[PDB]
Design an enzyme around this catalytic site. Structure first.
Site, PDB file in Angstrom:
ATOM      1  N   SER A  47      -4.735   4.019   5.227  1.00  5.01           N
ATOM      2  CA  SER A  47      -5.335   3.829   6.575  1.00  5.01           C
ATOM      3  C   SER A  47      -6.206   5.000   7.065  1.00  5.01           C
ATOM      4  O   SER A  47      -6.854   4.861   8.077  1.00  5.01           O
ATOM      5  CB  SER A  47      -4.284   3.479   7.624  1.00  5.01           C
ATOM      6  OG  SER A  47      -3.588   2.294   7.239  1.00  5.01           O
ATOM      7  N   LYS A  50      -9.715   4.010   7.860  1.00  4.07           N
ATOM      8  CA  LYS A  50     -10.110   3.343   9.099  1.00  4.07           C
ATOM      9  C   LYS A  50     -11.110   4.179   9.891  1.00  4.07           C
ATOM     10  O   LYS A  50     -11.953   3.626  10.596  1.00  4.07           O
ATOM     11  CB  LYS A  50      -8.906   2.990   9.983  1.00  4.07           C
ATOM     12  CG  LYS A  50      -8.065   1.832   9.461  1.00  4.07           C
ATOM     13  CD  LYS A  50      -6.985   1.391  10.448  1.00  4.07           C
ATOM     14  CE  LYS A  50      -6.294   0.086   9.987  1.00  4.07           C
ATOM     15  NZ  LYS A  50      -5.528   0.324   8.744  1.00  4.07           N
ATOM     16  N   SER A  94      -2.625   1.110  13.267  1.00  6.66           N
ATOM     17  CA  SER A  94      -2.961   0.945  11.849  1.00  6.66           C
ATOM     18  C   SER A  94      -2.966  -0.527  11.448  1.00  6.66           C
ATOM     19  O   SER A  94      -2.491  -0.897  10.375  1.00  6.66           O
ATOM     20  CB  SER A  94      -2.041   1.745  10.922  1.00  6.66           C
ATOM     21  OG  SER A  94      -2.052   3.123  11.215  1.00  6.66           O
ATOM     22  N   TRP A 187      -0.425   5.567   4.930  1.00  6.83           N
ATOM     23  CA  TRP A 187       0.754   5.408   4.086  1.00  6.83           C
ATOM     24  C   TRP A 187       0.399   4.351   3.051  1.00  6.83           C
ATOM     25  O   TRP A 187       0.356   3.159   3.366  1.00  6.83           O
ATOM     26  CB  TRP A 187       1.967   5.015   4.912  1.00  6.83           C
ATOM     27  CG  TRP A 187       3.297   5.019   4.201  1.00  6.83           C
ATOM     28  CD1 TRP A 187       3.540   4.985   2.853  1.00  6.83           C
ATOM     29  CD2 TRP A 187       4.575   5.054   4.838  1.00  6.83           C
ATOM     30  NE1 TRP A 187       4.903   4.982   2.624  1.00  6.83           N
ATOM     31  CE2 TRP A 187       5.555   5.033   3.827  1.00  6.83           C
ATOM     32  CE3 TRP A 187       4.981   5.097   6.175  1.00  6.83           C
ATOM     33  CZ2 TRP A 187       6.923   5.047   4.112  1.00  6.83           C
ATOM     34  CZ3 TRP A 187       6.329   5.118   6.456  1.00  6.83           C
ATOM     35  CH2 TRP A 187       7.286   5.099   5.430  1.00  6.83           C
ATOM     36  N   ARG A 227       5.460  12.974   8.572  1.00  4.24           N
ATOM     37  CA  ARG A 227       4.095  13.471   8.430  1.00  4.24           C
ATOM     38  C   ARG A 227       3.707  14.329   9.626  1.00  4.24           C
ATOM     39  O   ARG A 227       3.173  15.437   9.472  1.00  4.24           O
ATOM     40  CB  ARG A 227       3.134  12.292   8.256  1.00  4.24           C
ATOM     41  CG  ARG A 227       3.376  11.509   6.962  1.00  4.24           C
ATOM     42  CD  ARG A 227       2.675  10.151   6.945  1.00  4.24           C
ATOM     43  NE  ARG A 227       3.170   9.287   8.023  1.00  4.24           N
ATOM     44  CZ  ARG A 227       2.711   8.065   8.291  1.00  4.24           C
ATOM     45  NH1 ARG A 227       1.734   7.543   7.559  1.00  4.24           N
ATOM     46  NH2 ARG A 227       3.224   7.369   9.300  1.00  4.24           N
TER      47      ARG A 227
END
Length: 241
Positions: A47, A50, A94, A187, A227
């Site tokens: 992602s 994006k 996401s 991810w 993360r």
């Protein structure tokens, strides 16, 4: 340097996985983590793509920031995604199906020319316009991601300034006493091993920007929030936040 290197390494060791975080301050890049070879290893962007998908779609008049992408009734991975939403809504969630719809508007030929022009990763989108950032062939290293984020933070990507500002507004995820975090998580769950990303920058109240890219192996039962946790501990240790 040795003290920061040992501390940041320890945050990955505490997380019980292998990873790096790349930091870009001005003209200088620094690599930290517990498996430094990851810094020049290519991974699917997942992602994080994006960010670039949005820039391309807005620049080429395939969408706007106020356009509502309607749900078509087809089953999505999360019930939350089964709703009408904007590009900015989908960025924060996401919500891949919205960005697949955008990618299909752009189309394979234009998407490929844009990805090549921007110099993103290995620059190959292949022939499947709606999944190439999830499963390949497009791959990118953490150092390449931090350089993308550094350009974006400084409005140096090769898009109109207004387009970069529009996408930036979709990426605000956190604030620490006047310091703002603009970042996109990723991810890759459909590659093995799985890859986790958090790429973006800190924007300080005085206008300074510090870009970062965290890249880790996601383990079974590991939360996505790891993360952010590693990133923020690392930025704090460096005095960036």
């Amino acid at each position: 340097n040795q003290q920061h290197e040992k501390a940041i390494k320890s945050y990955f060791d505490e997380a019980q996985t292998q990873g790096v975080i790349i930091i870009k301050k001005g003209k200088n890049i620094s690599t930290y983590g517990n498996n430094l070879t990851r810094a020049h290893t290519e991974y699917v962007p997942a992602s994080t793509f994006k960010m670039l998908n949005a820039l391309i779609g807005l620049e080429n008049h395939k969408a706007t920031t106020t356009e509502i992408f309607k749900w078509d009734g087809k089953k999505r991975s999360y019930p939350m995604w089964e709703k009408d939403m904007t590009l900015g809504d989908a960025m924060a969630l996401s919500a891949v199906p919205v960005y697949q719809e955008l990618a299909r508007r752009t189309g394979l030929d234009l998407m490929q020319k844009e990805v090549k022009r921007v110099g993103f990763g290995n620059m190959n989108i292949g022939t499947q316009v709606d999944n190439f950032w999830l499963v390949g062939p497009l791959k990118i290293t953490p150092i390449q991601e931090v350089n993308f984020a550094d350009d974006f933070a400084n409005n140096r990507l090769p898009f109109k300034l207004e387009t970069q500002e529009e996408v930036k507004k979709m990426l605000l995820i956190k604030e620490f006493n006047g310091s703002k975090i603009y970042a996109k998580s990723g991810w890759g769950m459909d590659v093995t091993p799985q890859v986790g990303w958090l790429t973006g920058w800190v924007e300080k109240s005085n206008g300074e920007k510090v870009a970062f890219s965290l890249n880790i192996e996601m383990k079974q039962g590991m939360p996505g929030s790891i993360r952010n946790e590693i990133t923020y501990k690392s930025l704090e240790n460096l005095g960036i936040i």
